[PDB]
Amino acid sequence: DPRDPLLRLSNFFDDGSVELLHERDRSGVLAAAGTVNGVRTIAFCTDGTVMGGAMGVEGCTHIVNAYDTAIEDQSPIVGIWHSGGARLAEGVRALHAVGQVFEAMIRASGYIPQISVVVGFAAGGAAYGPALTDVVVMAPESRVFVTGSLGGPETHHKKSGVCHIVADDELDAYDRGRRLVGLFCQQGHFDRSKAEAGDTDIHALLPESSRRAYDVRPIVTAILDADTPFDEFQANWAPSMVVGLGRLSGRTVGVLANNPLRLGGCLNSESAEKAARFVRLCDAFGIPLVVVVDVPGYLDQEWGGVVRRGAKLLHAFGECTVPRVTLVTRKTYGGAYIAMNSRSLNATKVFAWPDAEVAVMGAKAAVGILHKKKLAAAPEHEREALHDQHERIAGGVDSALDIGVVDEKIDPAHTRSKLTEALAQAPARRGRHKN
Amino acid sequence: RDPLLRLSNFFDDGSVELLHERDRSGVLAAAGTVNGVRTIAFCTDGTVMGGAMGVEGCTHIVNAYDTAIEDQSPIVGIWHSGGARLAEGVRALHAVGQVFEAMIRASGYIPQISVVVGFAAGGAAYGPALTDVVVMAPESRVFVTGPSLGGPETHHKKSGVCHIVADDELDAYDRGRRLVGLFCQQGHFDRSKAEAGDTDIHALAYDVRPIVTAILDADTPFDEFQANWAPSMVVGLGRLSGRTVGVLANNPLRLGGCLNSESAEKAARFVRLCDAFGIPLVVVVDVPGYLPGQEWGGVVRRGAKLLHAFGECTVPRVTLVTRKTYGGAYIAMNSRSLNATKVFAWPDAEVAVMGAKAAVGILHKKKLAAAPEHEREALHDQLAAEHERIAGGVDSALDIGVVDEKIDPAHTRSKLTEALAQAPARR
């Protein structure tokens, strides 16, 4: 019973806003219409009461048919899933039908938003169905068994990064996917005198010694208003990188944080494809980003990936064209400085904190190449000179600022203020996707 | 290590034409030819501080790029570097990001081959990463480091950052030269440089590698990429009637010719590459499904990119099915679903989702629960005969339109040549 297409669409749509494309084609899916918090959205849920939900010819039809609506009406499209993959009896006709939907999504990839919202079953093509989409909000009772196990969002929030969002309950998946279509579509404009009310000294949320770890998620809370955002995609994945979407003086912004709590904020292969996909997202949807840099470097020692698996994040920033402001609070080193929306990748503006050092090796201590033939093997007795124990008399801002690659130094009380100011001064832009 | 000769040791004997005076930053950028093709190049000076990447150098590679893109010419990099001048600081470090910045404005437009010969750390280990084909010389250890660690044999396995491993530096120059003869000398299909070529091939688990070889020219080499990394999948360029051709085939040997988190990726970029260079393709199916990695996690989100690549694919892409092909993967391996050109087949090749034995499993549910045990395991081998026909029989998926027409084992090359030919070049 509760797996009813209309009962469900009725749960996502604000009640009396619903329409209906295809017949009550009791085939597997229902493709209704209507708005989300006001803004119109083509959708499609699947009937999990009618033959497993396994996607068939007839059922796929309205699905694809619904694409070319939302695609023609440049309105967003959403899919509350619940399918045991393809209908084994239909032969290939279904396989074909299962496969036209894929390409139905792929054509929308960045033209309209494509939230998927999986409530339960999700296998085979329906396991790849929402892969192609843009944001996967998994329902706490949704599983994934496509063997050609165990099931759950708890396994994808971590490990696989497959599921973008775990929901408090299936009903929240309706409530969650409903804001992502608002943020993707009611980003609105900026507001100069609205962050002014919330100019917290953000440097307060920073450790004492630039050596003592912390968690950047709390810092984030400050830059974003109080309502009520994050809405950060798989926190449990790429733990040294906390990406996430959200509003700022009304206007919606992508946020990519380098969380030093885990791995010391250090980037890596698995840490890139989080960002690397998250940037081109807010890029291909005209959403400003913010970069909160505090990363030492990048790495057991899997070279099995890295170089390629880290090139793409540069490619994410270097090809991106949305308004994007960077800021460094402490760290920013080497080929990782470069990789964090720096000027060499065409940043909008780049900001920094009082002790926001910027070097290719660090500073305490990063001299063991310059001072190579000295600070060496006389005793190891008293390593307080040392090398170990330049730094303060360089690195910070001006050491990179007169060079221009950093644009300013700022009072963190009005950290929020600055970005918003810097972000409001670029033009709206949006790109494509592929080659 | 000396840049000049080393650049004269790549170009056509001629031909090298310095796009500046020879300084000491650690870069030498010069124009020239390869089989008569306007080619721009650049090489890091292995001598000067280990080929390090600094400001006035990167600048030159930049101006190489601006000139490659200006003139619509491919762009090669020769790399005996190893990072970015540790004592030029942010300038150098920013000098590199500029080079990416160029290189990033290079994907999908002009060709870009990296032919590493010396060390490579940081930006030097990252330049290659933004260049389409990565050709790694023996001694050329991309000996990259964090904050062996990987030679050419090593960076062809589990990583596979390189594409064509060499066996000597100069030959690697014969690699990278011929390698532009494919992108910028694609050629045009010849209708009769196809005929005297198609064997009755079908007459042969197994190994797929030697099938691809018979599809392409008998003469022209099979420049396979990636091989040892992601092996259950096969990719690599060649020719057909003179027209350059891309090829990707399942690999009955490892992993049961199936898809896996690595597999789909290797094919994935490979396609996006070709549709970004007008080159047409050939896809010889034999995937019997997917596989995790036990990451059942990656393979889903990571499998998607096969769907995309073909979805977003506007170059010709004719498919050949060899025997079995199944589910998402079957759809994945260049199906009509993803706007395919045409699909041909061979007299003994089935298109289904799982197939007999499987195509009766769990469906009949009341089977291994309500049947005589001393026959269940044997009557499990029974439901396959009616199946094979009523399930998976290809004279099904003929009418259904997904496999255009069945082609004879003799008349194979002509076909994979014909359909690619009569097709449009764009859209």
Side-chain angles (χ1 to χ4, degrees), chain A residues 1-9 11-22 24-25 27-46 48-146 148 151-158 160-178 180-226 229-297 299 301 304-359 361-363 365-366 368-371 373-379 381 385 387-388 390-396 398-429 431 435, chain B residues 1-7 10-12 14-16 18-20 22-147 150-190 192-293 297-361 364 369-372 378 380-387 390-405 407-427:
Chain A
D1 195 304
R3 304 131 321 150
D4 191 281
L6 198 244
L7 165 60
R8 269 147 168 190
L9 285 142
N11 234 268
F12 208 88
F13 290 113
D14 26 33
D15 324 283
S17 353
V18 193
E19 224 84 344
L20 221 122
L21 294 196
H22 65 146
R24 189 23 106 86
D25 283 297
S27 56
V29 336
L30 180 77
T35 94
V36 161
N37 278 343
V39 61
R40 81 173 280 91
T41 359
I42 280 78
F44 73 119
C45 147
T46 80
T49 336
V50 185
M51 290 215 67
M55 3 186 334
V57 171
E58 238 276 47
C60 277
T61 314
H62 353 281
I63 294 173
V64 153
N65 306 157
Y67 266 80
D68 306 327
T69 313
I71 298 210
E72 256 292 345
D73 316 15
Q74 302 176 13
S75 15
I77 192 147
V78 169
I80 330 179
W81 292 92
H82 200 107
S83 168
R87 271 159 194 225
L88 172 56
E90 311 213 357
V92 302
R93 312 229 199 179
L95 255 333
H96 192 334
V98 178
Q100 294 179 301
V101 177
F102 279 178
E103 190 271 352
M105 310 236 196
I106 308 179
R107 291 208 302 320
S109 210
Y111 173 69
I112 57 194
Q114 279 156 101
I115 298 141
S116 236
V117 189
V118 181
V119 298
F121 286 164
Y128 306 115
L132 311 174
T133 59
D134 293 29
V135 168
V136 160
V137 179
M138 211 163 170
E141 70 150 72
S142 33
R143 311 280 155 273
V144 144
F145 187 168
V146 45
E154 322 200 87
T155 322
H156 288 348
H157 211 46
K158 246 186 186 293
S160 45
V162 168
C163 146
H164 282 273
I165 271 80
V166 178
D168 311 340
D169 42 79
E170 155 173 327
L171 189 150
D172 215 40
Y174 306 143
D175 267 38
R176 303 293 201 161
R178 235 180 50 92
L180 283 141
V181 46
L183 305 176
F184 264 141
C185 310
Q186 303 191 324
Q187 10 209 329
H189 308 93
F190 289 96
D191 213 85
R192 140 72 180 179
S193 261
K194 202 151 287 185
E196 310 285 271
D199 276 13
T200 297
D201 176 88
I202 339 264
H203 198 311
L205 305 103
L206 197 287
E208 228 71 287
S209 175
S210 41
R211 260 203 43 117
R212 315 251 68 257
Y214 56 126
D215 174 328
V216 79
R217 230 137 19 88
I219 287 98
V220 170
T221 273
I223 306 211
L224 315 168
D225 321 29
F230 241 75
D231 280 345
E232 58 193 287
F233 300 8
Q234 1 74 352
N236 306 11
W237 208 68
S240 55
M241 175 67 42
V242 170
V243 312
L245 240 188
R247 288 171 174 289
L248 176 66
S249 92
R251 188 65 175 77
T252 320
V253 338
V255 180
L256 312 95
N258 242 133
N259 209 9
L261 198 74
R262 313 299 328 243
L263 324 181
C266 300
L267 263 168
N268 70 74
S269 167
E270 320 219 329
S271 68
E273 20 211 55
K274 190 175 181 154
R277 201 177 241 253
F278 178 77
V279 159
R280 273 160 45 93
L281 184 47
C282 309
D283 166 49
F285 282 132
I287 317 192
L289 297 174
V290 157
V291 194
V292 198
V293 187
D294 219 282
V295 56
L299 20 145
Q301 199 72 355
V306 224
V307 158
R308 136 174 53 75
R309 283 293 138 220
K312 312 266 128 187
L313 179 45
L314 308 152
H315 202 283
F317 289 112
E319 152 240 86
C320 144
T321 64
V322 283
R324 55 174 191 276
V325 185
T326 304
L327 103 151
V328 31
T329 62
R330 315 190 305 174
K331 268 168 293 153
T332 161
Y333 305 168
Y337 139 80
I338 299 160
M340 292 325 259
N341 185 25
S342 48
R343 183 63 53 179
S344 84
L345 295 189
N346 318 278
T348 290
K349 276 198 214 148
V350 173
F351 296 107
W353 276 4
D355 314 278
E357 188 216 318
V358 190
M361 291 300 156
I369 353 92
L370 316 144
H371 321 69
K373 42 229 181 132
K374 194 139 175 73
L375 307 147
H381 189 17
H387 32 277
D388 284 330
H390 213 341
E391 157 106 295
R392 41 134 206 284
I393 61 131
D398 61 49
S399 347
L401 224 167
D402 241 10
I403 330 193
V405 287
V406 167
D407 312 310
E408 196 214 331
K409 224 179 311 166
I410 52 182
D411 185 309
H414 35 103
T415 271
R416 219 163 99 101
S417 144
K418 277 310 207 328
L419 290 301
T420 324
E421 140 230 72
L423 261 186
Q425 292 180 6
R429 325 257 221 116
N435 291 325
Chain B
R1 293 188 272 196
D2 192 84
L4 184 58
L5 169 64
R6 263 233 276 243
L7 231 175
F10 176 88
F11 269 131
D12 277 3
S15 171
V16 156
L18 239 64
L19 54 120
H20 60 86
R22 160 75 176 278
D23 23 69
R24 253 190 58 98
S25 39
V27 158
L28 183 65
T33 40
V34 167
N35 282 278
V37 323
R38 156 86 157 176
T39 274
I40 249 59
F42 71 91
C43 147
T44 74
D45 195 341
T47 62
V48 214
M49 3 193 56
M53 289 170 103
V55 171
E56 272 282 53
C58 304
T59 289
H60 259 136
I61 303 184
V62 151
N63 296 324
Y65 261 89
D66 290 345
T67 265
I69 310 168
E70 158 72 6
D71 298 323
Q72 223 159 133
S73 50
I75 168 136
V76 182
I78 301 161
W79 307 76
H80 198 148
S81 168
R85 253 107 173 269
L86 224 315
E88 289 208 2
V90 197
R91 307 199 191 261
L93 196 75
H94 161 82
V96 215
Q98 293 197 349
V99 193
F100 312 148
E101 219 306 314
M103 295 187 173
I104 304 154
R105 309 147 37 214
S107 190
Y109 191 55
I110 54 190
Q112 46 183 14
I113 305 98
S114 167
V115 215
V116 190
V117 299
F119 293 79
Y126 262 149
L130 314 191
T131 41
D132 280 325
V133 197
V134 195
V135 182
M136 186 164 175
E139 289 314 86
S140 85
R141 3 213 146 296
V142 109
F143 77 133
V144 203
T145 122
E153 164 217 297
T154 10
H155 276 102
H156 196 105
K157 291 152 70 85
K158 270 142 78 60
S159 77
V161 204
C162 165
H163 283 237
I164 342 183
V165 111
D167 21 19
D168 51 307
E169 182 203 79
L170 273 158
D171 135 295
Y173 288 177
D174 305 276
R175 300 291 178 111
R177 281 166 58 68
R178 193 173 63 255
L179 223 200
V180 351
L182 278 187
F183 275 111
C184 273
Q185 317 199 267
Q186 283 179 27
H188 310 354
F189 272 132
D190 191 318
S192 233
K193 219 276 171 292
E195 274 34 45
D198 17 334
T199 90
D200 153 83
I201 326 185
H202 190 340
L204 72 96
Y206 68 115
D207 184 320
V208 58
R209 259 197 244 192
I211 316 181
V212 169
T213 192
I215 321 216
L216 317 184
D217 291 12
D219 33 313
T220 311
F222 175 63
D223 329 50
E224 182 163 333
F225 299 7
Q226 305 193 244
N228 287 12
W229 179 86
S232 61
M233 177 59 55
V234 158
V235 327
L237 269 163
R239 289 187 191 289
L240 176 38
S241 331
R243 153 144 243 107
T244 295
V245 115
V247 161
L248 21 61
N250 309 115
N251 191 350
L253 210 335
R254 283 334 285 269
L255 333 190
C258 291
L259 288 221
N260 64 269
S261 192
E262 316 197 296
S263 287
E265 303 190 43
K266 174 169 168 179
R269 299 75 101 287
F270 189 71
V271 192
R272 267 255 185 275
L273 183 35
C274 264
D275 189 26
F277 284 106
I279 317 175
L281 298 197
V282 183
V283 202
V284 211
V285 216
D286 224 328
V287 66
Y290 257 92
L291 307 161
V299 323
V300 231
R301 67 99 188 274
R302 270 296 140 196
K305 222 13 196 273
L306 208 63
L307 327 182
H308 242 76
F310 292 128
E312 307 240 283
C313 215
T314 49
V315 279
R317 52 248 214 28
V318 185
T319 308
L320 206 59
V321 72
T322 40
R323 46 194 187 100
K324 33 169 182 46
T325 176
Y326 288 137
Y330 138 80
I331 300 141
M333 287 297 276
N334 189 7
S335 57
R336 169 67 39 86
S337 57
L338 294 162
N339 252 329
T341 310
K342 190 153 292 190
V343 162
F344 306 100
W346 285 358
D348 312 284
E350 145 167 21
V351 209
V353 33
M354 24 186 59
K357 299 225 146 203
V360 257
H364 282 173
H380 129 72
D381 180 54
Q382 263 241 333
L383 329 150
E386 2 288 291
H387 247 350
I390 69 93
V394 240
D395 274 346
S396 165
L398 266 245
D399 244 290
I400 336 219
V402 285
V403 179
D404 311 42
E405 66 115 310
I407 60 180
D408 174 77
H411 320 68
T412 272
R413 171 171 168 106
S414 163
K415 249 50 190 316
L416 300 183
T417 323
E418 192 221 56
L420 279 176
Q422 66 182 12
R426 276 322 247 263
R427 187 204 320 223

